[PDB]
Design a protein around this ligand. Structure first.
Ligand SMILES: Cc1ccc(-c2ccc(C(=O)O)c(NS(=O)(=O)c3ccc(Oc4ccccc4)cc3)c2)c2ccccc12
Length: 150
């Protein structure tokens, strides 16, 4: 729940700002500096993943044919099915970036009400299936470190 609330805040913020185009700047709950830095790496890396995977993401999004809230709920079984199954690494992030891509689509089709639930679906899939890996990787500090550039 420590890692969950922190992941939910980062993923939820990232998804909301990708959708609306407006950066939400208000609190720094659950390891404040780590979350600010996680959110920063996520918007640099996440935007790169969407840029470099526009064709795949557009293809997949069209295939998914998300029209309403119930279509967003149906996404979770595919999400769990694909996201687990094999090897886990920071690159596999693509999960969040694809989520941000879907969140953008959701704003476009007047389904902004599904962005927060989608963020919760992604966090549930991420934290509940990979907690042990995440804690061993020092959580979001690990994500920040792995993607640290300069
Ligand atoms: C809302 C939402 C966020 C993130 C994922 C997700 C999960 C795992 C991976 C992964 O690779 O572990 C991933 N990365 S992906 O390459 O974008 C991708 C790879 C395979 C997919 O399956 C299809 C299923 C159906 C249609 C086309 C493709 C889709 C995307 C992204 C979602 C995956 C599925 C649905 C919603 C999702």
């Amino acid at each position: 729940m420590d890692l969950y609330r922190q992941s939910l805040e980062i993923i939820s913020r990232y998804l909301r700002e990708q959708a609306t185009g407006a950066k939400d700047t208000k609190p720094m709950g659950r390891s404040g500096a780590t979350s600010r830095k996680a959110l920063e790496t996520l918007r640099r890396v996440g935007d790169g993943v969407q840029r470099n995977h526009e064709t795949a993401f557009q293809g997949m999004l069209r295939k998914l044919d998300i029209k309403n809230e119930d279509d967003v709920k149906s996404l979770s079984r595919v999400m769990i099915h694909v996201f687990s199954d094999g090897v886990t690494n920071w690159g596999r992030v693509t999960l969040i970036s694809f989520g941000a891509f879907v969140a953008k689509h959701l704003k476009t089709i007047n389904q902004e009400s599904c962005i927060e639930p989608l963020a919760e679906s992604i966090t549930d899939v991420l934290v509940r299936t990979k907690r042990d890996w995440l804690v061993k990787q020092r959580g979001w500090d690990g994500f920040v470190e792995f993607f640290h550039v300069e």
